[PDB]
Amino acid sequence: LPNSIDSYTDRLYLLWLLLVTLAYNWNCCFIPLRLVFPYQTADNIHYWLIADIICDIIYLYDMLFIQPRLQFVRGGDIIVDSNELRKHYRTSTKFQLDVASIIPFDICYLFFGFNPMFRANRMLKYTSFFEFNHHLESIMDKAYIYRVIRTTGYLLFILHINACVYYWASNYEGIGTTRWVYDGEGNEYLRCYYWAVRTLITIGGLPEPQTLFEIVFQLLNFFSGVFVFSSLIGQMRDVIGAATANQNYFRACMDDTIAYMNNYSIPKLVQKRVRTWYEYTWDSQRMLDESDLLKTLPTTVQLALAIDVNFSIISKVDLFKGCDTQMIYDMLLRLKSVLYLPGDFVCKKGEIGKEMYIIKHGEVQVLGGPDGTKVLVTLKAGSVFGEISLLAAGGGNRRTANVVAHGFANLLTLDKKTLQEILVHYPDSERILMKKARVLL
Amino acid sequence: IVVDPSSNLYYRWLTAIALPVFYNWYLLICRACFDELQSEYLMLWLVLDYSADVLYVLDVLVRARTGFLEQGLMVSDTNRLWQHYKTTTQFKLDVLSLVPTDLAYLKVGTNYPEVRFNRLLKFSRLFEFFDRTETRTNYPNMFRIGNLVLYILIIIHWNACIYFAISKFIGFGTDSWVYPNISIPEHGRLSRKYIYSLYWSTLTLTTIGETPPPVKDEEYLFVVVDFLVGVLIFATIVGNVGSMISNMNASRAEFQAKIDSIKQYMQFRKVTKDLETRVIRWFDYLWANKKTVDEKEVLKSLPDKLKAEIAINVHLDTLKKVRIFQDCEAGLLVELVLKLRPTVFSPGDYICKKGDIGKEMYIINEGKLAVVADDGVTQFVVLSDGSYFGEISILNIKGSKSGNRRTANIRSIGYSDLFCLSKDDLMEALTEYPEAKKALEEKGRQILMKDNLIDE
Amino acid sequence: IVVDPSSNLYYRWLTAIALPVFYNWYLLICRACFDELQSEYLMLWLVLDYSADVLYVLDVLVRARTGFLEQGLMVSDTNRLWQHYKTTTQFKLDVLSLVPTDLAYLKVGTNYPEVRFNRLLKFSRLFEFFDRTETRTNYPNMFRIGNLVLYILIIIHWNACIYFAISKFIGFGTDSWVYPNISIPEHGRLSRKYIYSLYWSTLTLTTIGETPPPVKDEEYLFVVVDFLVGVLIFATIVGNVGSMISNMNASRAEFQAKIDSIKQYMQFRKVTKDLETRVIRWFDYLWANKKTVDEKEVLKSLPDKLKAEIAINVHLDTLKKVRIFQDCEAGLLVELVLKLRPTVFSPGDYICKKGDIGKEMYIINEGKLAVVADDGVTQFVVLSDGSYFGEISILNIKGSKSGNRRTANIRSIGYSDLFCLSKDDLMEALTEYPEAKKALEEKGRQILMKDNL
Amino acid sequence: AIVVDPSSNLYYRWLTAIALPVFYNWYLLICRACFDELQSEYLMLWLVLDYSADVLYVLDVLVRARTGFLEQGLMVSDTNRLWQHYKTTTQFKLDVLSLVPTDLAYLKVGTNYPEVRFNRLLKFSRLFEFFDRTETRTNYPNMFRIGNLVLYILIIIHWNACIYFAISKFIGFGTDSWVYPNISIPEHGRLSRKYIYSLYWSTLTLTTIGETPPPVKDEEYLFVVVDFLVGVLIFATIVGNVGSMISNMNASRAEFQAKIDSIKQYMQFRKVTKDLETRVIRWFDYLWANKKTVDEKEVLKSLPDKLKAEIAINVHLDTLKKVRIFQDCEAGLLVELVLKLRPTVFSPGDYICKKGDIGKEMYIINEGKLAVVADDGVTQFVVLSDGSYFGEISILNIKGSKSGNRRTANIRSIGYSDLFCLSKDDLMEALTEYPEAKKALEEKGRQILMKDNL
Numbered sequence A: 001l002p003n004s005i006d007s008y009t010d011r012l013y014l015l016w017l018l019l020v021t022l023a024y025n026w027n028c029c030f031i032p033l034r035l036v037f038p039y040q041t042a043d044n045i046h047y048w049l050i051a052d053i054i055c056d057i058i059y060l061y062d063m064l065f066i067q068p069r070l071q072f073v074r075g076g077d078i079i080v081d082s083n084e085l086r087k088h089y090r091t092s093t094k095f096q097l098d099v100a101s102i103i104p105f106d107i108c109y110l111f112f113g114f115n116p117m118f119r120a121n122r123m124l125k126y127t128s129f130f131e132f133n134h135h136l137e138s139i140m141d142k143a144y145i146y147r148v149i150r151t152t153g154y155l156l157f158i159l160h161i162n163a164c165v166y167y168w169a170s171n172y173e174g175i176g177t178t179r180w181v182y183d184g185e186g187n188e189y190l191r192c193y194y195w196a197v198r199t200l201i202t203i204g205g206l207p208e209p210q211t212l213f214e215i216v217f218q219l220l221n222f223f224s225g226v227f228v229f230s231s232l233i234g235q236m237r238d239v240i241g242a243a244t245a246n247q248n249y250f251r252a253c254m255d256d257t258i259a260y261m262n263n264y265s266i267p268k269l270v271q272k273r274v275r276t277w278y279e280y281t282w283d284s285q286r287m288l289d290e291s292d293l294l295k296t297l298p299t300t301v302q303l304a305l306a307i308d309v310n311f312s313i314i315s316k317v318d319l320f321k322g323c324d325t326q327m328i329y330d331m332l333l334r335l336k337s338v339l340y341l342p343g344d345f346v347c348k349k350g351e352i353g354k355e356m357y358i359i360k361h362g363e364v365q366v367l368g369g370p371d372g373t374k375v376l377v378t379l380k381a382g383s384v385f386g387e388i389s390l391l392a393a394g395g396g397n398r399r400t401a402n403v404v405a406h407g408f409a410n411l412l413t414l415d416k417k418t419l420q421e422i423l424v425h426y427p428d429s430e431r432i433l434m435k436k437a438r439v440l441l
Numbered sequence B: 001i002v003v004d005p006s007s008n009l010y011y012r013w014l015t016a017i018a019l020p021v022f023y024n025w026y027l028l029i030c031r032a033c034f035d036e037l038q039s040e041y042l043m044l045w046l047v048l049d050y051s052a053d054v055l056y057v058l059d060v061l062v063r064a065r066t067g068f069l070e071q072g073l074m075v076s077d078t079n080r081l082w083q084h085y086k087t088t089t090q091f092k093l094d095v096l097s098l099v100p101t102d103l104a105y106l107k108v109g110t111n112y113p114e115v116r117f118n119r120l121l122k123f124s125r126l127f128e129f130f131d132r133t134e135t136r137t138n139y140p141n142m143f144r145i146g147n148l149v150l151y152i153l154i155i156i157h158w159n160a161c162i163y164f165a166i167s168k169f170i171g172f173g174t175d176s177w178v179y180p181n182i183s184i185p186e187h188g189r190l191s192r193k194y195i196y197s198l199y200w201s202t203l204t205l206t207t208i209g210e211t212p213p214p215v216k217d218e219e220y221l222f223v224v225v226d227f228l229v230g231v232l233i234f235a236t237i238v239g240n241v242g243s244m245i246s247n248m249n250a251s252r253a254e255f256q257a258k259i260d261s262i263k264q265y266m267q268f269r270k271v272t273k274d275l276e277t278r279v280i281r282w283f284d285y286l287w288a289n290k291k292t293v294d295e296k297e298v299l300k301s302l303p304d305k306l307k308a309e310i311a312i313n314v315h316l317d318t319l320k321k322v323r324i325f326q327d328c329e330a331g332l333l334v335e336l337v338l339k340l341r342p343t344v345f346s347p348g349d350y351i352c353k354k355g356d357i358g359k360e361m362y363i364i365n366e367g368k369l370a371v372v373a374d375d376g377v378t379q380f381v382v383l384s385d386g387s388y389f390g391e392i393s394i395l396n397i398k399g400s401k402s403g404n405r406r407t408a409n410i411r412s413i414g415y416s417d418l419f420c421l422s423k424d425d426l427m428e429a430l431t432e433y434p435e436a437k438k439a440l441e442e443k444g445r446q447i448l449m450k451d452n453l454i455d456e
Numbered sequence C: 001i002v003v004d005p006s007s008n009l010y011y012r013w014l015t016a017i018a019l020p021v022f023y024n025w026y027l028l029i030c031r032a033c034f035d036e037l038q039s040e041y042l043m044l045w046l047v048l049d050y051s052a053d054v055l056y057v058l059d060v061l062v063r064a065r066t067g068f069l070e071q072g073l074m075v076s077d078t079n080r081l082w083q084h085y086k087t088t089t090q091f092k093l094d095v096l097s098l099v100p101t102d103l104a105y106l107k108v109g110t111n112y113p114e115v116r117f118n119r120l121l122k123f124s125r126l127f128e129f130f131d132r133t134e135t136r137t138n139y140p141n142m143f144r145i146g147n148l149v150l151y152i153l154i155i156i157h158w159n160a161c162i163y164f165a166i167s168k169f170i171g172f173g174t175d176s177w178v179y180p181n182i183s184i185p186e187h188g189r190l191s192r193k194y195i196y197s198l199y200w201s202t203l204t205l206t207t208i209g210e211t212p213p214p215v216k217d218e219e220y221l222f223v224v225v226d227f228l229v230g231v232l233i234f235a236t237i238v239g240n241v242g243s244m245i246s247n248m249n250a251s252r253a254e255f256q257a258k259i260d261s262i263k264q265y266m267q268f269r270k271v272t273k274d275l276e277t278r279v280i281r282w283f284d285y286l287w288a289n290k291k292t293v294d295e296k297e298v299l300k301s302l303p304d305k306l307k308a309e310i311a312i313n314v315h316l317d318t319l320k321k322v323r324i325f326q327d328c329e330a331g332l333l334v335e336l337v338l339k340l341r342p343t344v345f346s347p348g349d350y351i352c353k354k355g356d357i358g359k360e361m362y363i364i365n366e367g368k369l370a371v372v373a374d375d376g377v378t379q380f381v382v383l384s385d386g387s388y389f390g391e392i393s394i395l396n397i398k399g400s401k402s403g404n405r406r407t408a409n410i411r412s413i414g415y416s417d418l419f420c421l422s423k424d425d426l427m428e429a430l431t432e433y434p435e436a437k438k439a440l441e442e443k444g445r446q447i448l449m450k451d452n453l
Numbered sequence D: 001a002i003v004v005d006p007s008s009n010l011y012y013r014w015l016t017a018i019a020l021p022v023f024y025n026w027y028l029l030i031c032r033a034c035f036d037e038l039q040s041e042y043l044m045l046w047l048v049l050d051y052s053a054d055v056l057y058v059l060d061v062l063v064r065a066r067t068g069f070l071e072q073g074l075m076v077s078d079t080n081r082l083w084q085h086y087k088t089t090t091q092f093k094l095d096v097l098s099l100v101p102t103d104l105a106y107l108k109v110g111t112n113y114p115e116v117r118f119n120r121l122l123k124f125s126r127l128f129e130f131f132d133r134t135e136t137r138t139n140y141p142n143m144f145r146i147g148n149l150v151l152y153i154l155i156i157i158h159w160n161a162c163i164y165f166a167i168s169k170f171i172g173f174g175t176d177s178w179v180y181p182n183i184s185i186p187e188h189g190r191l192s193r194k195y196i197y198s199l200y201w202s203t204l205t206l207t208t209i210g211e212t213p214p215p216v217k218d219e220e221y222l223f224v225v226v227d228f229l230v231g232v233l234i235f236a237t238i239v240g241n242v243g244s245m246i247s248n249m250n251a252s253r254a255e256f257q258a259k260i261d262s263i264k265q266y267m268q269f270r271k272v273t274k275d276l277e278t279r280v281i282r283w284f285d286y287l288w289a290n291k292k293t294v295d296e297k298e299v300l301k302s303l304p305d306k307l308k309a310e311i312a313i314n315v316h317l318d319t320l321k322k323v324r325i326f327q328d329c330e331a332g333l334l335v336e337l338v339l340k341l342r343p344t345v346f347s348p349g350d351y352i353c354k355k356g357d358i359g360k361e362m363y364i365i366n367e368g369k370l371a372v373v374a375d376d377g378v379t380q381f382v383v384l385s386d387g388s389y390f391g392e393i394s395i396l397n398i399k400g401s402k403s404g405n406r407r408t409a410n411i412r413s414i415g416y417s418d419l420f421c422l423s424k425d426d427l428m429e430a431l432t433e434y435p436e437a438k439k440a441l442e443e444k445g446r447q448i449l450m451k452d453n454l
């Protein structure tokens, strides 16, 4: 087994956590099932003992050969040497629960006979089930499906425990003694599970409780079933409200913009263009603005996400070829993403020039014909145009040609004003840009 | 011809293909399970299944020639549409939905319509129709409760057919739980068959459970599985209605939180109750006149192209009527209608008094101001919608005898929605237009030496 | 006379017209389906229906002369009010509500009050009364559960009458599902009819369902439709009460999220536990004294005129007794009370020690400060409400003997609520008042050349 | 004399000691009023417990006569002013109505009617004060919220049980199939059977399960329809409170999963390479799993500036005083500088700074480990650890410097670093009000550079 286990990029550790989860779920299901129901008979004890020995071997191989080899983070740096990982496992609060789990109480099978309540300390290894829950929530892209699966599995487990406790109350009152207890006719687990299902969902339709212990049992089981049904509705409400939060927030902002435009009697061509923008921004980004997402991130992950998207594109630019890399990084951080519709002008012939355009996932077309509509240059994604307009001052640069968007063009935009607000910190690159302006202009 | 998927024609085809899919789901499970619908009205189902299958072949040829966006533009190369359809997993479900299993009608003799269950594989057109309908409609919560009612009707109907098929497999009338003896003419009608199976599924899946209890262990297992499926489905649907109601009145909750926060501030800070009545009356106006959201935050995410189009569709005919902004360039007026900031005033609220610092120019939209006197309210000029004042206060020409003062007592007669072009926003918008800035200074100097200036 | 809809007289008319609309809904379905209320108390329902139609024609006269807002002003001429009313679809519902279908009483002979169901078309006055009561009251959640209880009581009552009409149409006592035989004197009473039908509709529409099961196909279909309507009713009640509970403690959940975030910050950054219990004691004070919201974001959604008027009504008569601001211009004082910043200080918190940079001016509100003596508990003098200090430190007089230092150790005896005027906020408020800036600098120079310049 | 602070812990111990007999008075006074075997069979027990509850009630009115309140932020400590402020309060009327002696009416009816003690139920505000002071005080707010919900609906289910038993006594026991059965039968005549079946009936009714026998009379039909509408309201508050409890338990995890989903949608939209995608997702999962997921500027923003300044003293001051240039400065400058410190977090392999970069930051290492690598890649020269610092002369902008605010080192993060950044603009903004310390800092940095390279 590898001297170290990563526990994040390791899928064999997820398979091992599935194995310890199968052993733990075997214990937590089949210890009340063998404890209450008479399925642990004398000609069946070898299969139960073989399965318990396999689950204890899975418990011991976790404690001795897997869980000491787990990597962790101590003060920031990743620990990989085996003795320090072993000491971190031994000084954990996981190890107390694990060594309290496999305490071998099965040697009390000699004294008190076979009893599944001696293995109940094996139900204390819940942390491996919670780590498998956390790793399967992390590896899944849509985690609400696993939240529904976990809520269903918790519901089936509490119904299993309620069926076992009802069969215990049936054997405590005597089988077939009153009308409320299990009569003994068909399958034991299936009809006690039917009673647990009709009690814990508060369906009713069962025979009424006759003696006082059965009235106390039906009272507590109906009250617990009210809270189980309430937690089931609350879990499904939380799953739906967390799954559709972004879509309903986008729809609320779109209906706010539509109600603002209907308040001011803005015409339906402009409202159709605004609705087309909102539809393409939901179909492409699945969010309104990337700026309010990126502004809550720290600055290093912002700089890394700005470098991996546009730094090769700005290093292709001959205007900013000579500049220093930190000013390029600040103009990477201060880029603004604007979506242009089909037919929208990113540059009108004769308008003022203030912006540098980095086209990503779109196409713009430079209309420079004799009549003014013949497409001269079609600029695909990853192109930079209008970067010389950032150096002219005052009026300065006027756009010489019409540049319209061919389809939906997602431009990235650096203003002249934000370039000057960046360039007050960097005088050397400002001198290189101004001497390039004096040479070329 | 290439079908654009964002058209009205594509939504009309989504309706025309969501009709035989819902037909196939509902009517194929009750024809498969009930066996008198399939035997009695046989030529009706042959005509309807031939129409559904020719709609399915028309659906695969529409999907072979539908557009998809690549680099923001729709692809119209039909060979590229055919290859992009062929490498899709929807094409496999479509050709499995159109295999001729009705040739298996030649052996089994047309009483077994469960061979058309491959026709249920086109569920994605029904889900696409529901998604495009709740994207297209203006009642999204009403369509969402209607879609949840349609989902529970499909689930109640499918469970009715499943309960009737289980009662047919166990045997009719042999048990107290199953559907009764169909040789009896009371229970032998198809109407009582479907309506009692629908009654059993509505009682069972909603976890009310007032049906006769099971007597065999297969029936116990089916009623346990059906109660579990019903509590999961209806807990999901009650949580969905709860999330939809909690997002229906989220804006009223936010507005009531703002109202109660400002109320607790005003009772905490010992504000006098006439001003507290003015604040509560302004909040009553703001809720009763549907003006609760604000322009700066509802136009925060749009680009400046569409914000510029929105702002020139309201402010540009008023801004072109200003004496200094009469003959300006078009891009400067686009920048100036982007710089406009709304303010709302109560009745009797003074916009500006004599001697205040004039640094804003107010454009009047939906309101009536009054240039009143100093001591009492003697209205000299009643300014209306489309009017303006205070452009000389934001020009600040050299040597003015006003000296950025207001020289007018302007108070609001009713509720006004004024738009403010400040001096800082004007001098920031004029940074790209120095010639127009000199024209503004010369036009304001023209106005002031028609009235009052000192040569300094 | 023109009534405008924002007044209290319009709300009193909304109460006076919401009474016969609710009467029309409730008692018209009950008199339509139960047939002994209409026969027994006939002159009572004739008097009540006549008074309800008198209130209905008074409602169409009030709606013809109610105001509306164009350009922010209430319209007060009756011709334009009547034209704006008659172009509306609510006028069509009012005149359809006021058709004389009681002339059909001359044909069918007064035992059929289902002709008066056009009087149910004025539901919008009841919905308008519920909306205006939800805005005007100070218990919005208590009114919202009362309104939800009234809505589901209307649906329980309507389903009781619908069950009695279906059992009348099928036949009384012919089935186990229907209402029993009314020739029996136990079931034939009107009290037993209405209360058992209400019991049936409450057992059916709340999905409890211990009613006798249906036998016929119409009864099976009605019970399926009524169970699905009851499932949607239970989902509506659960969603409304769950959203109302989430609205009732949204502030407690947000403040507990702030407390747990600052607690996780203080265990993460290893803050010592004396400061940790000081922060926890300040949060306990902030929740126990109901100052849990921050005024900077509380006063943001107001307009600038109301923000300026509220800042005048709290701070300006306190700022006018400041010795440098006794003779300043009025708009300068409006800008300065807009530039004030509130701060809350714990007991024992030093406002300023001897030797710190004086860049703020503190005006004491709701507090008591003490000029303690050089890291000691001994106090020279105690300050009170309305007092001020640090006023000459922000004026920036050239040639000051102090040099923007405090020269005082000031501790808070109890919890204070000081108002802070910073030096930079004073300078950006004194940007557009230069003569007032020269007057402030000359007044501070005069106070210092009285003492030490 | 003695004045108890209402914000203290002794007042909370009194809130427990007065919330015990109030909950006792509610629960057992309706049970003794409607059940009539608890009142008769256990008479000396209820006399001892009612005398103890009235002793606690008169001690509550003397504690409320001596409890403090805040005027001008100070606790009022004179008992005459506390007694006048208590005398002009509407809780004083409820307290003396709770101590109205109706027990003389308990004398005359033969000690079988505890209905006269229902004025003792007029101290519900002490129970509500114990509940809201506990929900602010305790470390489990959601567990206390569901326990308070369970206790509230148990009080309502118990009161409805006593109401159903009083209705069954007024109609008559066993005369109908809906009422409680015949109490002369010794199975139903037990008080355990009476209370447990009435509690079972009201739990069936008030949670809309409805396994009860159906009513046979009009008053029973009317009580059942009113009780079912009250029960569907009770079930709606149960589902709403447990749903808001579930939404409050995982609000932060849902907020973090929404941030992770938005980051993943951004990196899928902008075509970020998968190496950086796995690095950023593993970094954010580290920041969540090590309980440092929150942003410091938004966390500290609700605190006042005195508590923010004292917290920034308690974290950054003694590590800022170990900087060589900030070793001997004025203390208010150091307080303003630790207010100006902003945190940054780094991934493994992330460069803090390379050679030839414009040095505008002064990084102080906390909970991290850096490495001064060479220019070709990872080759350690000096391994920088916690408490260390670099880049102070680059922000000190010394005149005529041969380095010239450059970095002169390639510094990579070995593991996950959490550095504290002091910008050049933040240093100059803190150095606006301290010109003397600014010239001392410039002369100290100039002397350090003249000792090394100038």
Ligand SMILES: *[C@@H]1O[C@H](CO)[C@@H](O)[C@H](O)[C@H]1NC(C)=O
Binding pocket: B172, B173, B174, B181, B182, B183, B184
């Ligand atoms: C159904 O009815 C027919 C005749 O009415 C009878 O022969 C048959 O046995 C019945 N089926 C059952 C299951 O009783």
Ligand SMILES: *[C@@H]1O[C@H](CO)[C@@H](O)[C@H](O)[C@H]1NC(C)=O
Binding pocket: C172, C173, C174, C181, C182, C183, C184
């Ligand atoms: C109702 O009672 C009357 C007399 O009591 C009887 O004639 C009639 O048949 C009964 N109706 C039904 C449906 O049994």
Ligand SMILES: *[C@@H]1O[C@H](CO)[C@@H](O)[C@H](O)[C@H]1NC(C)=O
Binding pocket: D173, D174, D175, D182, D183, D184, D185
């Ligand atoms: C209750 O039981 C006693 C004796 O068992 C009997 O005399 C009495 O009539 C019964 N009362 C009722 C209402 O059944």
Ligand code: NA
Binding pocket: A202, A203, A204, B207, B208, C207, C208, D208, D209
């Ligand atoms: Na039920």
